[PDB]
Paper text:
[name] (EC 3.3.2.6) is a bifunctional zinc-containing enzyme that catalyzes the conversion of the labile [name] epoxide to the pro-inflammatory and immune-modulating lipid mediator, leukotriene B4 (LTB4). In addition to the epoxide hydrolase activity, [name] also catalyzes the peptidolytic inactivation of a chemotactic tripeptide, Pro-Gly-Pro (PGP). The elucidation of high-resolution crystal structures of [name] revealed the binding mode of [name] and PGP in the L-shaped substrate channel with overlapping active sites. The channel can be divided into two parts: the wider polar region containing the substrate entry site and catalytic center, and the narrower hydrophobic tunnel accommodating long fatty acid tails.
In the current project, new inhibitors, 4-(4-benzylphenyl) selenazol-2-amine (TTSe) and 4-(4-benzylphenyl) oxazole-2-amine (TTO) were synthesized based on the lead compound, ARM1. Specifically, the sulphur atom in the thiazole ring of ARM1 was replaced with other chalcogens, namely selenium or oxygen, resulting in the selenazole and oxazole derivatives, TTSe and TTO, respectively. Similarly to ARM1, TTSe and TTO bound to the end of the hydrophobic substrate channel and interact with the polypeptide chain of [name] via hydrogen–hydrogen interactions. In addition, the hydrophilic moiety of TTSe and TTO was coordinated by two water molecules connected with the peptide bonds of A377 and S379 from one side or D312 and W315 from the other side. The hydrophilic selenazole or oxazole ring can rotate via a single C-C bond; therefore, densities of two rotamers are detected. TTSe and TTO-bound [name] structures are in a closed conformation which is in accordance with stabilizing conformational changes observed with DSF. The binding of inhibitors results in the conformational rotations of Y383 and Y378 which together with catalytic Zn2+ coordinate the substrate for efficient catalysis. The Ki values for ARM1, TTSe and TTO with [name] were 1.5, 4.8 and 3.8 µM, respectively. Similarly to ARM1, TTSe and TTO did not influence the cleavage of the PGP tripeptide by recombinant [name]. In addition, it should be noted that ARM1 and TTSe do not affect the activity of recombinant soluble epoxide hydrolase (sEH) activity, whereas TTO at higher concentrations may affect metabolism of fatty acid epoxides.
Author numbering: 4 to 610
The structure:
Amino acid sequence: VDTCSLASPASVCRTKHLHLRCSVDFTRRTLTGTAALTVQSQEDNLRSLVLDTKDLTIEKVVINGQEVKYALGERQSYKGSPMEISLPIALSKNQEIVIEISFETSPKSSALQWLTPEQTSGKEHPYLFSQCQAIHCRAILPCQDTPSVKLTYTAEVSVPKELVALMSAIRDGETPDPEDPSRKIYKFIQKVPIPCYLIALVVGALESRQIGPRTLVWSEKEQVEKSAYEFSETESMLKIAEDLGGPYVWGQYDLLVLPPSFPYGGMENPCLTFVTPTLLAGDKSLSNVIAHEISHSWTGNLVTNKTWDHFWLNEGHTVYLERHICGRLFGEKFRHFNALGGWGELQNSVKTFGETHPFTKLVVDLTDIDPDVAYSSVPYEKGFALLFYLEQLLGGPEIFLGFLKAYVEKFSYKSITTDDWKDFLYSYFKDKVDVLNQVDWNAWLYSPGLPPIKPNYDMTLTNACIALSQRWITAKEDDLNSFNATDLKDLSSHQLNEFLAQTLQRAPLPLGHIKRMQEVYNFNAINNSEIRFRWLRLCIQSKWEDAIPLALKMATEQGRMKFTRPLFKDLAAFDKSHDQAVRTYQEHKASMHPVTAMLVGKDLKVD
Ligand SMILES: Nc1nc(-c2ccc(Cc3ccccc3)cc2)co1
Ligand SMILES: [Yb+3]
Ligand SMILES: [Yb+3]
Ligand SMILES: [Yb+3]
Ligand SMILES: [Yb+3]
C-alpha cells in the first residue's frame, strides 16, 4: 500500500499506457486536454476505479465513445481529491479498456511553474516547466500517482508556434496544429514503462546543441554555449554508467538547462534530464550532478521504489553509482573524498533534524506527511553510507559493483521495497551470509540518527581542507596576519568547497576572521554556486552585515532549494537581516516555484 496515493492500487488495476493530447495556454496558465489511460483490470468483476487528481477541472470521462459517471471526493490536503470512475461494463481479470478524461489544470498546479517573459533569459517569450516528483503528476493529469505502477506513454502537445515543447520521451515529430495555424503540435513517445513521477514537460524558446552521439543540450539561446562546455563529459559518464549498470535502454540522453527557479539540482526525467543553471560554474566542477542523473537511468528509472517510504533505494544506489563514475574519471582518492564529504552532509542533516527525528530513518513512514516536507539529504547519504559500508564488509568495490549490476538486471522494469532489496542482497551474497548477519539491520534501516558504524575513508584529498579549516578555527587575532592567498594555491575547487564546509560546521567564527578571509581569499569573487552558498552561509551565520545583500541576491536570483532554503533561514536567524528576509520572501512569493514558495514559507513561519 502506497499511503501517498488515493488511487486504486496496482493489485486492483494497472495503467499500462497514457496517450496525452493537450494544449498549453499561456494566457490562462492552463494545460487543457485528454488523458487516455489504457487500464488493465487485476481482478474479476471490476466495476469502478479511483484516480489521483489535484486542482484539476474534469469536463467528462468517456469509455466506449459514451460519457460515464464519475465523482470527485473531498480534497485530502497535499494528496488532492480522489476521482471515482464507474465503468460501463464490468471487467474480467487482465481485460484492458481505454478511459479518456477531458481535464484542465489550475494555474496554481503544484507540478508547474509558469514564467513571464521577464523571468526568462530572452525576455520575449514565456516558459513552462513541470516537476512531478514525488506526487505532483496528479496536479497535471488524472492518474494512479504511485511509483508502484509503470506505464508507457505517447503525447501530442499544442503550443504557440514560436515555442518548442519537450518531454521525458523520444521526440516523434512536429507539425502545424491543423486546428490553429498560430500553433504547432509536438509529438512524443516513451516506449519504456515508467512510473508517472517521471512524466515531464517543458515549453519555451529552446535551442539545442549536440554534445555527444546520443546527447543534445537544450536551453534558451543565451545558455547554450556555456551548457555545451559545462556538460561535455556526459557521453564519457554514460559509457562508464553502461559498464557498471548494463545497457542504457532509453535511446537518447538529452539535457535541459532550466531557468534559475528549477527547485532541484537535477531531475532524472527519462530521455531528458532537467538540470539547474546553478551547475554552470565554467569549469565542469559540478558535473557530479550529471553523473547522478545519468545513474538514475538504472537506479530509479529501471529499478523503482514501490512507495516513497523506500525512496532511499533510488537515491542511495544512485549516489553510489555517481561516486563510482566520478572515481573512474578522477580516481579512487576522489571517490573517497566525495564519500567523506557526503558523511559530513549526513552529520549536518542529522544535527538539523535532531538525532531522534523520524525523517533521519532510512525507511520512513510518510502516512499523513507531505513528501516535499520530508525531502532531505538523508536518503542520499544514509543510503550511500549503508552501501559503502556493505562494499567494505563484502570485499570491496569490484565485488559490490557485481551485486549492483545483478540487482539492476533482477529488478529492471519493476517497483520494489527495502525487503526485496535485502532478500536479493542475501541471495547474491549467499556465501557471505555470516558477514551480512553481523550488520545491525534494525539500526541501519529503521533507527533515527547517524548510522551505527562509520565506513573507512581515504583521507588523502581531505587532509589539506581539514588542516586549513583548523588553522582558521584555532586562530586568534594575532594569527590572522599569517593567512595569505598562497594558502589556496594547491586546493582544487572541490577542496575549497570542503574547506568551507568543514568551517561552516563550526560556524559562527569571529567577525574579524571572516573579514580577514575575504581580504586574503576574495571568496566574494567566486561564482561557483556551491562555494558561494557555503561562503555566504558562513558570513551570515558569523553576523557580517556586508554579506546581507549578497545572500539575499543569491537566495532570490536562483531557486534551487538546496541553496535558497538555507540562505533564507540564515538571513531570518540574523536579527540585522530578519525583516528584509521576510519582506523579500513576500515580494517574490507569487513568482516563485510553488513547492519552493510553500517550503520557504514554512521555514520562515510566514503564511
Ligand atoms: N530516508 C528518507 N527518505 C525520505 C524521503 C522519502 C521520500 C521523499 C519524496 C520526495 C519528495 C520530493 C522530491 C523527491 C522525493 C522524500 C524524502 C526521508 O528520509
Ligand atoms: Yb467474472
Ligand atoms: Yb516516429
Ligand atoms: Yb487540437
Ligand atoms: Yb531470503
